[PDB]
Amino acid sequence: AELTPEVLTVPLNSEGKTITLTEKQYLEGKRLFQYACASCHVGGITKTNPSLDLRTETLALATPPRDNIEGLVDYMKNPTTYDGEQEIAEVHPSLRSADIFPKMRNLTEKDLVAIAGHILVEPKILGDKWGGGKVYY
Amino acid sequence: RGWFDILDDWLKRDRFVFVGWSGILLFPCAYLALGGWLTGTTFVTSWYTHGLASSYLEGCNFLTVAVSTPANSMGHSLLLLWGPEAQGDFTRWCQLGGLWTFIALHGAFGLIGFMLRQFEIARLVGVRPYNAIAFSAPIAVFVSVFLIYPLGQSSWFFAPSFGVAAIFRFLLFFQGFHNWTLNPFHMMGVAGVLGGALLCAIHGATVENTLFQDGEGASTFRAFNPTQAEETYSMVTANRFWSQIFGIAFSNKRWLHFFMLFVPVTGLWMSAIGVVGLALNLRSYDFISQEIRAAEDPEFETFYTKNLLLNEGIRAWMAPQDQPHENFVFPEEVLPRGNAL
Amino acid sequence: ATNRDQESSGFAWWAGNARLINLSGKLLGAHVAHAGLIVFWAGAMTLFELAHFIPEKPMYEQGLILIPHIATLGWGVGPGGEVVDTFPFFVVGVVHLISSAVLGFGGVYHAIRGPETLEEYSSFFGYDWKDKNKMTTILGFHLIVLGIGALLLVAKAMFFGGLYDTWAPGGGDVRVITNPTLDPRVIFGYLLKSPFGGEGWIVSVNNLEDVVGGHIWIGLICIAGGIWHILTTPFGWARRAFIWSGEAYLSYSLGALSMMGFIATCFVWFNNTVYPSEFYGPTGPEASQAQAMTFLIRDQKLGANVGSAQGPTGLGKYLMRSPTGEIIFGGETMRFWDFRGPWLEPLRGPNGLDLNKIKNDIQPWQERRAAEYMTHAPLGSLNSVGGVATEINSVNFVSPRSWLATSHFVLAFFFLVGHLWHAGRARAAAAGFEKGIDRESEPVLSMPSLD
Amino acid sequence: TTGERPFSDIITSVRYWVIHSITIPALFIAGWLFVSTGLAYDVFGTPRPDSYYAQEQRSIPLVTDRFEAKQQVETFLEQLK
Amino acid sequence: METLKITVYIVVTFFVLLFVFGFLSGDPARNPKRKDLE
Amino acid sequence: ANLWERFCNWVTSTDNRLYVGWFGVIMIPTLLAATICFVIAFIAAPPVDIDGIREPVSGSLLYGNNIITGAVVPSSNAIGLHFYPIWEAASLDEWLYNGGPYQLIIFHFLLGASCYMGRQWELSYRLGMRPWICVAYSAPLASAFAVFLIYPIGQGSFSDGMPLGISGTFNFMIVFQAEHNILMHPFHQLGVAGVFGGALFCAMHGSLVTSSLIRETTETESANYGYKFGQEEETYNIVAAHGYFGRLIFQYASFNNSRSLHFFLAAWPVVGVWFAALGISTMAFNLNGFNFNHSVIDAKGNVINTWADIINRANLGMEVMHERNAHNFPLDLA
């Protein structure tokens, strides 16, 4: 098995356009995700609210859809509750709240894209492990 | 003085590494067991037997490398290189776990070799063979754990695998499945090992702290001569000290040292008996009275019932990956779990 | 080569430094050189930390133990403990590193070039261990030095920027201490508190006024004591109580340091005042409490009445009573109700956690802080995999509180062992049987049998 | 003593180091190449990182038949295309 | 309970004092060789 | 001599069948209190709410235990690290429900055993001995401290201290493995080297001295009668024992020096066990065993399990099952 261009091809938007990430992008994504996100989201779960995970199906049923690059980049700029009803930047790391979540300060657009790509690719690799929690360790 | 006697002459020469007749068995078997372990842990996988990486080549470290047991489907096959499974193919043989039986068997014969060495040298030097006799405990342990135990079970697969973390797993498996800590033979084993350690410590320290001043040095090691006739420490002072501290004390040195042989050797022998029981799943798993009371009375709780809950967790959560040949699929909803965790 | 083999010195190479006991010059060398080593590590380690320092990451995410010490002193940080200027860190490092060259210079000089004994060279610097007067004098000098140090802390706190105050109103911030606690009832009050739960002895000090006042007291006490020991000689009862020899003194100091090491272990494990959680990460209690807080907040947002929610055991799922009645967080964290922290205290009323405050007054910054601390609990592996022992690799984290506590427990333990060793030996040497029992005069042989 | 030359003598002799300053690096390099050329993989049948699974497979190639185990492994290896 | 507490406090203080004064009572000299250790 | 002087002379007397001494002055009452309370509790104490969730665990014989299952049960999690002496309870019944006996026993015992160590120093001093037997004893003592005091401090509750019972001990071990992966901790591994090695060297030394006993007896009597207490001559030939062992391995692997040898015998298990104690004492502050969970990964990113991951699954079983009603939130943070 290998990390192929096909594995690294993920939905860019809701309209069926894809984008193919480079291996450097994938590595940057893992690094940045560990840097700014893994403290709560290690393995694709959510420690401070385990009801919500980072599985692609879950993101797809989110509002607005979060199972593509644009959705995840937007979430990292202006995170909402699962129904899209509330903006939660005040209690969730984002560029909008980089003042109170300082690790968000040196994150570039390029970075957000890499993180997004990591979140989308990783379940293609790990399957049910991603968002599975300890049952699948 | 024919060829046999000439050979005996050469075998028993007083060289840097003594050979002896026993050396003919010992050195090749010990060399092959050590070499096999190093070869396996450096280069050889456990993908096809366990679904595990187990070598430096694959990225394992010292703690996680192992030469792993064969697949359960091999049963108790001797798994000889020229046998019907590998059929002479070295690579397939490695992939099927041939190195495990290779190491266990060359190792067993090597241990026989070493104990024979102890007899042979004792006989040549003119001492009593109590060192060999004491070495019977390592033998009993090796034979009960690596040979008898798996022979009682379904296959070589459930023998210990030769590796650090692999052995740790063996321990946890025995807790979860056999409740081995509950076993009075294991307990006697523990008493013998910890008691052995205690005697080692206390005897060494006592001798070192009842030394006669036999020199002017503040570093007192030089004030001893192997050829000297005199005891180098005071047994009388040692005896009074321990009599006044602990209530009782050795007064007889010969008894002291025999006892130092007796405690750990006996302990290991008892543990061996327990493992021979576990070969047949003949466990000290439960106390029946406990279970009858607890089944009828949902408020009755002891540390025994607590530990069984732990065991049940271990079994359910470790079996599917630890026993891949069983093809266990335990849906989430059936996994035993306490609140939240 | 005086006293540099076993034959002449009586000591083997592996106890070679025992050859230094009555060579005051060379021994001076060993000590000043060692001080050089200490200062060297301080400076070098600081520079290493600074080079590896990303200012917008929490210190405690970056394996830092010294920069937190500098920051606690008020240098380099602003509100909330945010790094506003790294240059003071740089200065502390550079200056320690430069000073270690001087110390090492003096140490090497005295150790292999200067007078091997100081007594013929100088009556001032020379000493005999058995000379109780001189010993108490040198002790006095060093007491005065220590007092001066404590006063340097006081001066930093009161006249040179102040200290980082995690309890500062409106949020943690650097604050000048203007009214230090001078009342001895309070100061020594700490000294007479139980070390057990909810009391915590001196480890419980929870405001900078008490810290500063304590160091004022300790400074005056040390200077006074130092003068005292310069001007006096041990009294008779003291003379009859102690062993008077180099190894004896070493043993006494080893006991002292063992004790201090244990105390420091507890300090860094429990205290979040002089070890601000902003810099050191949350304490164990703190992170456990923070988890309770976090899910109370989540579930209450979902519509739960957290005050009346009965858990599986019958105790409150979120809230319960302490054995004396205070309202506290439920679950296992019931053990940690003595915890106090700037993010939790606004929810605390006279009877403990206040249900009305919990329902109406919880701020976003509190949610944030509780989440941060819950997810940076001081748990992690030896290879720095953050989290519980069953966690998968992903987060590179072990709390500085864990590093400091474990390191100093190990050191305190071995220093207790060292105390037993050198005390027992000093006794035996002073009585004259450290080399073994005299065969022709074996004491037990002159004693009546036990039976 | 038992007739052999003291190790102290040998390892501090010039000739010893003339020999072994060649033979030790040679061996080290030989082992190095045993890995770097990939020969180790093939001698011992150890999977390279891309040979544990076929691309979409997620089932361990566990040996399940004692006497046709060899053929099973061979089949498993063919299954990596 | 208060009587119990007072009692234990008095007891513990008694023995602790025995310990301290005991070791203050010329203990270095209580050995089989060199007694002059003052 | 005055009464106090006489008293001191008796206390420190070298002629008492059991040495008292000043450490003994503290040791004797504390060990007696710990012992008595322990025996009474082990036989007759009612169930104790160890985990503070009103789920009382039965430890004593009269309440349904045998020798193997019985225990004096650690004090309640509700108490945490609070000092809970008898006079803090409203009644003996409350005291018993909350695990008071445990605290009384372990505190009196830790004090008493510390004084036991001191007493070993003291008698060594009175008898004209060298002083370091007590240093050897510091190893088991440190271990005792580790499991009865330090680990509770670190975890914030005496409810997590080792139980005073056999099965309770095993409980402590398994939960410890769940929460610290102690088996993968190098200090525990050094501890194992310490006690396995101690046992090895115990047997080895025993057998070597026994092998070289000088003939002094006939075949119809015990060889032990060939040694007489206080005889000045050594009772075995160490040159013969060394000839043997030196030939068993090679000559320079063996000790010809009895002092050196006995020092080794003291140092190996003592140091090993020192590291075991420090292992418990530092996992007390959650610096845990090596974690190589999912450390090996293939080219695609599939996890390739090692034996470490199997260990992890076992630990997971322990973790999710232990104290099954005590956790309300997803992380076990102490």
Ligand code: CLA
């Ligand atoms: C004395 C040292 C010694 C001992 C006791 C063993 C023992 C063993 N070896 Mg090891 N081995 C050794 C040295 C030794 N080996 C050496 C020096 C090498 C390097 C060449 C090896 C390399 C090696 C490999 C590669 C393997 C073994 C294996 C084994 C096991 C099976 C052997 C077997 O069935 O033989 C059967 C043969 C005999 C017992 C010979 C007896 C001969 C009789 C007494 C005389 C009559 C012979 C007769 C005239 C011959 C006629 C033949 C004719 C019909 C064609 C057994 C545990 C196998 C194993 O461990 O699999 C798990 C295995 O695969 N060994």
Ligand code: CLA
């Ligand atoms: C912090 C650790 C430390 C320190 C400060 C010392 C200091 C000392 N040791 Mg001890 N020792 C130590 C650890 C230490 N030791 C250890 C770990 C062991 C076991 C290996 C010993 C075993 C031992 C024995 C057996 C003896 C000593 C002796 C000594 C003294 C004389 C050394 C001498 O004359 O050698 C001469 C050495 C040289 C000429 C080589 C150069 C040495 C210098 C110091 C190197 C400096 C390097 C440094 C980077 C230079 C910076 C320069 C810059 C500032 C300009 C000296 C005071 C001796 C003694 O007590 O004599 C009375 C003695 O016999 N030591």
Ligand code: CLA
């Ligand atoms: C201020 C602290 C201090 C001081 C000044 C001394 C001073 C002395 N000690 Mg004491 N000792 C201490 C603390 C101290 N000790 C502690 C904490 C312990 C408990 C372990 C001891 C236990 C002890 C024993 C058992 C003995 C002494 C002895 C001595 C004397 C000779 C020391 C020597 O030359 O060793 C030379 C130094 C070495 C041989 C180095 C040892 C190597 C250590 C163990 C390495 C530690 C590992 C390291 C921290 C991490 C790994 C690094 C590695 C990877 C590079 C000297 C007076 C001897 C004596 O009795 O003299 C009268 C003696 O026998 N000490």
Ligand code: CLA
């Ligand atoms: C008070 C002591 C102390 C503490 C609490 C820390 C803590 C830390 N160090 Mg620092 N450091 C120290 C001393 C200390 N260090 C010393 C002496 C040096 C010079 C070697 C350094 C140089 C250093 C570097 C270069 C780095 C750190 C880093 C770190 C962080 C990661 C630690 C790690 O992964 O360890 C791994 C754990 C071990 C290696 C295990 C050590 C176990 C020892 C050997 C056992 C000793 C027992 C005893 C002393 C032996 C006595 C013998 C007996 C017989 C008596 C952590 C915050 C890292 C970091 O993140 O920086 C930002 C980093 O890169 N440290």
Ligand code: CLA
């Ligand atoms: C700290 C412990 C210490 C002690 C007790 C001594 C003691 C001694 N030294 Mg040594 N030395 C030391 C450290 C020490 N030195 C250091 C750090 C260095 C490197 C600079 C040296 C380099 C050195 C040399 C080259 C020589 C000595 C000499 C001497 C002897 C003559 C002292 C004298 O008459 O000065 C007179 C006193 C003064 C002139 C006043 C000093 C003013 C001080 C330095 C101001 C700073 C005070 C402040 C507290 C410093 C804090 C430092 C701290 C923060 C680390 C005396 C035995 C001489 C000797 O041995 O002759 C045979 C000699 O030639 N020393």
Ligand code: CLA
């Ligand atoms: C480095 C610190 C230090 C050291 C090593 C010494 C050493 C000494 N002092 Mg000095 N002293 C010091 C600082 C120091 N002093 C300071 C700062 C002051 C001013 C406060 C003094 C004021 C002072 C006076 C007035 C006297 C001494 C005396 C002495 C000598 C005998 C003391 C003794 O037996 O203590 C052992 C301690 C005791 C016997 C006290 C009773 C024992 C109880 C049970 C101790 C329990 C404490 C407990 C374990 C601690 C826990 C915390 C606690 C607060 C609850 C000894 C040389 C005596 C002397 O001979 O002077 C010439 C003396 O009369 N000192």
Ligand SMILES: CC1=C(/C=C/C(C)=C/C=C/C(C)=C/C=C/C=C(C)/C=C/C=C(C)/C=C/C2=C(C)CCCC2(C)C)C(C)(C)CCC1
């Ligand atoms: C199996 C087999 C065989 C055999 C082979 C052999 C015999 C081999 C050998 C091999 C070998 C023989 C190898 C070796 C190796 C070694 C190594 C690999 C080592 C390493 C080391 C190290 C790593 C070290 C470490 C350490 C220690 C230990 C301590 C001190 C410190 C340190 C850390 C340094 C034959 C062919 C018959 C047949 C087939 C099968």
Ligand SMILES: CC1=C(/C=C/C(C)=C/C=C/C(C)=C/C=C/C=C(C)/C=C/C=C(C)/C=C/C2=C(C)CCCC2(C)C)C(C)(C)CCC1
């Ligand atoms: C006595 C003795 C000893 C010891 C010794 C010692 C311990 C010494 C020490 C010494 C020392 C302790 C030294 C030090 C030094 C230091 C130095 C020399 C430094 C320098 C520095 C610099 C040059 C800096 C630079 C810089 C800057 C300025 C800026 C930033 C960056 C940098 C860092 C680059 C021994 C054991 C051997 C043995 C013999 C005897």
Ligand SMILES: CC1=C(/C=C/C(C)=C/C=C/C(C)=C/C=C/C=C(C)/C=C/C=C(C)/C=C/C2=C(C)CCCC2(C)C)C(C)(C)CCC1
């Ligand atoms: C700074 C500070 C503070 C303060 C502190 C203080 C004020 C301290 C003091 C302290 C002290 C004030 C201490 C003391 C100590 C003492 C000791 C540690 C003792 C020892 C003793 C001994 C060791 C003795 C012994 C003996 C005996 C018992 C018998 C007879 C003999 C002899 C002498 C050997 C506070 C917390 C407020 C806050 C924070 C900051």
Ligand SMILES: CCCCCCCCCCCCO[C@@H]1O[C@H](CO)[C@@H](O[C@H]2O[C@H](CO)[C@@H](O)[C@H](O)[C@H]2O)[C@H](O)[C@H]1O
């Ligand atoms: C809370 C802890 C209490 C702290 C108290 C601190 C007190 C500091 C001053 C202590 C005074 C010591 O006073 C000490 O006691 C009595 C007084 O008759 C003496 O009494 C002793 O003398 C000799 C000394 O060889 C002994 O053999 C004899 O057994 C005993 O009579 C001690 O030799 C003396 O040194």
Ligand SMILES: [Ca+2]
């Ligand atoms: Ca003076």
Ligand SMILES: [Cl-]
């Ligand atoms: Cl789900």
Ligand SMILES: [Cl-]
């Ligand atoms: Cl449990």
Ligand SMILES: [Cl-]
């Ligand atoms: Cl909980």
Ligand SMILES: [Fe+2]
């Ligand atoms: Fe012996």
